[PDB]
Design a protein around this ligand. Structure first.
Ligand SMILES: Nc1ncnc2c1ncn2[C@@H]1O[C@H](COP(=O)(O)OP(=O)(O)OP(O)(O)=S)[C@@H](O)[C@H]1O
Ligand SMILES: Nc1ncnc2c1ncn2[C@@H]1O[C@H](COP(=O)(O)OP(=O)(O)OP(O)(O)=S)[C@@H](O)[C@H]1O
Ligand SMILES: Nc1ncnc2c1ncn2[C@@H]1O[C@H](COP(=O)(O)OP(=O)(O)OP(O)(O)=S)[C@@H](O)[C@H]1O
Ligand SMILES: [Zn+2]
Ligand SMILES: [Zn+2]
Ligand SMILES: [Zn+2]
Lengths: 385, 385, 385
């Protein structure tokens, strides 16, 4: 067909450019198609309004979606294959004013998961991070907004840690990609298999490592914490702007600070900044007023260099190509446990940690921005500085 | 054709007078016709009682309603075109003791939606408003009664922030304006497309900005907060007499307070006041004693220029033409976060917010009455403070 | 049948090596079986993928699990006896991506039933325990999670109170031990001999002490309570984490509040906590804030020491050797009854009880931990939320 011919090419072009998502959107007069690359959407094509139905058909067919239904959202999955390329897609259709909208999400593979040496950790923090994950039990929290690289990190860790002498059990919503040598369980709300329900079962499963996909309940916060106290390694995900507030979040979710204190081994706060395109990279001579505001001594200010991409055909005008990770790693020690009990605020916990040598998201992004890995713009945007 | 001539004229006059609604009311010995202008009903004309059924007939033909049925309400939509007039009309017929009443609403378009610079924000509030909508994720609430300008503000915001690198998704009941650049979806009961069912689907649609037209049920209030939590920007409308009560209401609706404190960027409480007609505008010497019980200081009573419109042909005698918005903008910071958890009252929150810089509705009203934008009574009639 | 033979061989080999746990894990092309020996998982054997369901059915029948239910976790206990192979198995089935995973833990072979003086009650709590179980009649509830030591405690009580001048009748699912001096009846669902059917018969068997293995009906709860009212002593097992919630549990099962208030002598809640290896004990300097937060008085904090096992040859790798029980004893008085009728919450009731001097599991666990019986972390794990 011609609609079949379009879906093949847009998926192929997405796989070739490492696009995260494909948006097929009807509008007043046309159909716009967009690709998400490096977290940001780009224009790809524009179709005649009549093209919409046939295209939606091709997509819905791939995922076993009902062509008859156009009044309700639908959800499908397809293992898509075209000679060279092989990728799973999650298809989503949504009724819109101008007709159904389709979104195709290209899922990653276990192949794609990095080793912990290739995460982007600075030299000093890397050795601390290597240490905290090597502990035999406790709970290690990874926090940040969606698209922060949190899953990539958690599985990077599990890739180094889940050896055959251990049981590695995972609760996930959904399971994105299957990992060899660990046990994975998928949340099933229709059946009633919730995060809290599966976690309770894990305790009956002789676990060694438990991966909690996401902590939203009080209930899962307690069980995840109880697994930790029981003597297991717990890797879980929380949604917090900061490392320290993960401590306060657990308190508000109802974990008493003495439980938190006896189980929390460390918190990692992750954000994902965009990487300056190499072809169109250009030095910008910077601004002493910022750098001043992130109290970089005025000895490290005129030594400092900053960079931006200019936009070229090789980055679609973006000035960016690929992404990089920035890290705020809070390691729990004997001065911090005491501050968790006694009830210090997140701000107070953080000043202690920083005074021990914790680098913040800002301070990390900046160190990477002074290498031209990313722009100062991107750093202040994803964090708050 | 005489009834056709009347309907033709009254829509023409409503159009030119910026009239929300036309009211055609059967009364004991006549028919009364009123225009709502600036939110206030206004006498337009009187018809002789035996002319009712001809006029209702014209109105029904326009919206394709049944003439035979006079015992049950009816509803229609017409795209009205006469001369240079192009308006969408919503038609309502309803049996009353003296016959059927008719209401025709004149609908606005996307072109009527202002730029955020033209929303009427005081300069100190406007800079904070801007910093609130420019955040990457979180939930921002716009509260107040119907006809307060909630939608105008919402889309004004989306005009500035729904840039083409982002997915901007809408759920609405109904979709009012057709907006370029964004994706809109309408609630559909008959198909089972709830607010909550739509919103659940949005989370598999790779969204950046989410707009929830109205939060009515407890489930929708939870999913929108969740979506904010995970890393999405959410703009939603709520009904509260006060900015602080939007916090409390989410609580009452079932949202975990730790989730509220975590996701909430801010609240905007809004009303509409009437502008002083400036063909009537006559300066009025303020009464200091009355301006003192109203919490204004001695400095503010100086530099106070009050006005009242002495009715004219252009303002229909009311002394007012046009409307203006008054604002109460709660910006969430850490102290408001700690008070949201720990279950402080709305009154407690409010006093925190003010101490931190928030102007109440009354205060923003008074401030603009001293600029002669509006009059004192309008401020007092639109604010219980 | 080939499946049945495999399961018998694995349990045989686990038994003989003294393996802790047996793991049957589906994989992508493979069903992998692992044994945990001396703390580590070792590879036992590999089964083809198409053998998975056959094996899972075998182990489900052994633990009385549902074969049909494949998308929820299940749990059962089994006593495996084939020849010299005699071992209590805890069975756990977990839904995973490649199918159901089954885990079987080999339980430490049950020790002989002790005197109530060796159950490990605190000195003060013990005097109350002794006083509750001396009562001539009424119902005494023993409650807690699976493997709490419930059955072990009830038979220890029966060891003391079941005297030859009394008839002591027992309804069990199933019968575990072989105690002299008493009469024991096992539930036969096949024959129609239910918990409730037996309990009505017991009232025609002239009893003195009745023991119900489990209350999981309304009718059983109602008959057991009725038996307590007429003037029989009833020891019964519930599965509630909190002692005070066990009262609410009976109300949910339909027992009239006034029959609960008149019959309930008290409720025992217990946990099993791992014990520190004596040959390996070290002193830990505890944190005053933590102790304070756990309700310890300033006098007690003064010379408080805590203990940990470092890992010793005697205790394998872990610093723990054997178990000990912690207790929470709710003794019903006149005030409690008044709360039950016109029912206050389990929270209020627990408050009242604590005000009358009732020790909590954590408080009980703490003091035992303060003596070196166990670690705080073991105590915190079994008392969380
Ligand atoms: N360290 C990294 N360096 C560069 N790119 C990365 C890195 N980690 C992740 N990415 C990319 O960014 C995307 C974000 O993926 P994720 O790791 O899932 O982030 P996440 O949203 O925090 O994970 P979730 O939502 O908890 S399942 C990945 O698909 C990769 O394309
Ligand atoms: N800032 C403003 N200044 C002056 N007039 C305004 C302003 N905002 C809105 N209006 C007028 O007031 C009318 C009602 O505003 P809306 O925003 O549509 O009402 P709303 O009830 O607050 O929100 P809804 O219920 O979702 S339409 C608009 O149609 C305009 O005519
Ligand atoms: N106070 C105790 N100290 C040491 N070990 C105990 C104690 N109580 C029980 N145990 C042992 O731990 C196991 C406890 O099992 P039970 O006493 O049967 O518990 P239970 O509460 O009946 O569990 P369920 O739900 O009936 S399977 C038994 O093997 C006991 O031998
Ligand atoms: Zn470039
Ligand atoms: Zn005028
Ligand atoms: Zn030891």
């Amino acid at each position: 067909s011609a609609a079949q011919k379009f879906v093949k090419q847009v998926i192929r072009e997405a796989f070739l450019q490492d696009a995260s998502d494909i948006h097929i959107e009807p509008r007043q007069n046309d159909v716009q198609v967009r690709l998400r690359i490096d977290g940001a959407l780009r224009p790809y094509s524009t179709l005649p309004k009549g093209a919409l139905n046939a295209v939606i058909s091709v997509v819905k067919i791939m995922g076993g979606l009902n062509i008859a239904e156009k009044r309700l959202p639908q959800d499908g999955r397809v293992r898509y294959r075209e000679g060279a390329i092989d990728v799973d897609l999650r298809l989503s259709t949504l009724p819109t004013v101008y007709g159904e909208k389709a979104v195709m999400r290209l899922l990653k593979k276990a192949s794609d998961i990095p080793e912990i040496e290739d995460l982007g950790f600075a030299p000093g923090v890397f050795e601390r991070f290597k240490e905290v994950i090597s502990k035999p039990y406790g709970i290690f929290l990874i926090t940040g907004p969606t698209g922060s690289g949190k899953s990539f990190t958690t599985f990077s860790i599990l890739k180094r840690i889940a050896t055959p002498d251990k049981n590695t059990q995972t609760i996930e919503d959904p399971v994105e990609y299957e990992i060899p040598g660990i046990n994975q369980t998928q949340v099933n709300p229709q059946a009633g298999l919730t995060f809290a329900r599966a976690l309770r079962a894990f305790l009956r499963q002789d676990p060694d490592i438990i991966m909690v996909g996401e902590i939203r309940d009080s209930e899962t916060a307690k069980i995840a914490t109880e697994a930790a106290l029981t003597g297991h390694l717990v890797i879980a995900t929380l949604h917090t702007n900061d490392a320290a507030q993960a401590i306060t979040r657990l308190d508000e979710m109802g974990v008493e600070p003495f439980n938190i204190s006896a189980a929390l081994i460390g918190v990692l706060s992750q954000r994902l900044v965009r990487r300056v395109c190499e072809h169109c990279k250009v030095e910008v001579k910077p601004d002493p007023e910022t750098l001043r505001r992130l109290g970089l001594s005025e000895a490290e200010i005129q030594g400092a260099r900053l960079y931006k991409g200019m936009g070229c055909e090789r980055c679609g005008g973006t000035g960016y190509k690929g992404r990089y990770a920035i890290h705020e790693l809070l390691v729990v020690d004997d001065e911090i446990r005491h501050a968790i009990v006694a009830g210090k605020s997140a701000t107070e916990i953080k000043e202690i940690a920083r005074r021990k040598g914790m680098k913040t998201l800002r301070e990390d992004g900046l160190y990477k921005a002074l290498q031209g890995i990313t722009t100062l713009e991107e750093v202040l945007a994803r964090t708050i500085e």
